[PDB]
């Protein structure tokens, strides 16, 4: 008995939370093994992991199985509003266009799905970007503070206060441009490709199936991640200030001084994020099936 929007918001949020918490121990072990040398350097670890199974036996055996979900609450407080806004807005923009595959032509309908995905991504980003910046600032200040380094902020509000006072709204949305281009591509292909391919391939007994929905979302996230990766290279590279003027000069100078290949480097890692995203989409549809 709530609006059509708030329902999607809550469905997207819940589905995002379930998806993140589900894929949490795999990402935990992935990080643990990937960043073990830097831990030996900082004195956080004493000897390497002679295997993924040993990494499990080790961490879980000392502090319990729950140790696998360390740091997940922060990822859920980041991811919940992000995906909630994304899904609610996708269905809204989809209804704003309101294309019927049969009434308006398949290519125009798919363009409707892609446009909706992109628009929703851009809107969510506009709302959550400053929060991501502030949480990051506070976390880095906490690490420096942990090691005896001088503190800069009391809390999030202090981050907002100080950054607003020095650079204004631009300070909070620092490096927004390549961020919104990348997200309009990524969310466009994410929502657009999933919704456009789902009725085509998932027909008959697969119309209500979940494993099929997750696998389709898995492909979609894989491909979309790969397609949106160069804008992520330009984004990360431009926010590295914490060397280039405008994303177009960063693009041209990187392609000319490193190569086109350099932009794509680091693409393989997205593979686990690909699971999370995929799970959010499938769990969402399933969640709507039981709801309506």
């Amino acid at each position, epitope marked *: 008995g709530m609006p059509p929007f708030v329902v999607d918001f809550l469905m997207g949020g819940v589905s995002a939370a379930v998806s993140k918490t589900a894929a949490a121990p795999i990402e935990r072990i992935k990080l*643990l093994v990937q960043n073990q040398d830097e*831990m*030996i350097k*900082a*004195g*956080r*670890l*004493d*000897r390497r992991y002679n295997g993924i199974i040993d990494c499990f036996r*080790r*961490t879980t055996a*000392d502090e319990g199985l729950m140790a696998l979900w360390r740091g997940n609450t922060a990822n859920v407080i980041r991811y919940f509003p992000t995906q909630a806004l994304n899904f609610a807005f996708r269905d809204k923009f989809k209804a704003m266009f309101g294309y019927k595959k049969d009434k308006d032509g398949y290519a125009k309908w798919m363009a409707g799905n892609l446009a909706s995905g992109g628009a929703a991504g851009a809107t969510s980003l506009l709302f959550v970007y400053s929060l991501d910046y502030a949480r990051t600032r506070l976390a880095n200040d906490a690490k420096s503070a*942990k*090691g005896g380094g001088a503190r800069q902020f009391n809390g999030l509000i202090d981050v907002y206060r100080k950054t607003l006072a020095s650079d204004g709204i631009a300070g909070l949305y620092r490096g927004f441009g390549p961020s919104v281009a990348g997200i309009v591509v990524y969310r466009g292909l994410y929502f657009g490709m999933y919704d456009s391919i789902k009725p085509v391939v998932l027909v008959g007994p697969l119309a209500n199936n979940f494993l099929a929905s997750f696998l389709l979302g898995w492909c979609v996230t894989t491909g979309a991640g790969i397609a949106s990766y160069p804008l992520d290279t330009v984004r990360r590279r431009m926010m590295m200030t914490s060397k280039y003027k405008s994303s177009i000069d960063a693009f041209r100078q990187i392609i000319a001084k490193e190569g086109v290949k350099s932009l794509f480097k680091g693409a393989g890692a997205n593979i686990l994020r690909g699971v999370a995203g995929a799970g959010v989409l499938s769990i969402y549809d399933q969640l709507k099936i039981l709801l309506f």
Partner: nanobody
Amino acid sequence: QVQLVESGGGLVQAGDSLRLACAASGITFSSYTMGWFRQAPGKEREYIARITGSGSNTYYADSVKGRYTISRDNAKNTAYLQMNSLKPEDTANYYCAARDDGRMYQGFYDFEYWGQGTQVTVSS
């Protein structure tokens, strides 16, 4: 129950060499990383070195690189620290620590058991 008792160390001339011992009682020694630290009055404590439980890998600090050499004996349950080419600034109370092998800790100063330390004074 578990005690870390520092052995060796006294007053020595500059440039001479010392060996400090660390006797660990009450625990499985063949499974604990041993660490060496020092504390001098007016100076914040600093981590010297660390050695794995099986005596496979050793790690040092930039301040005592190549000068100090850490080792251990599981048959005697002792950790050794060899101090060479000493300078007057090395004058400190050297203490010993121990922690389980392969547990992730917040940093260098996070250990299970701590010793009380042996005074080391370097004359000029």
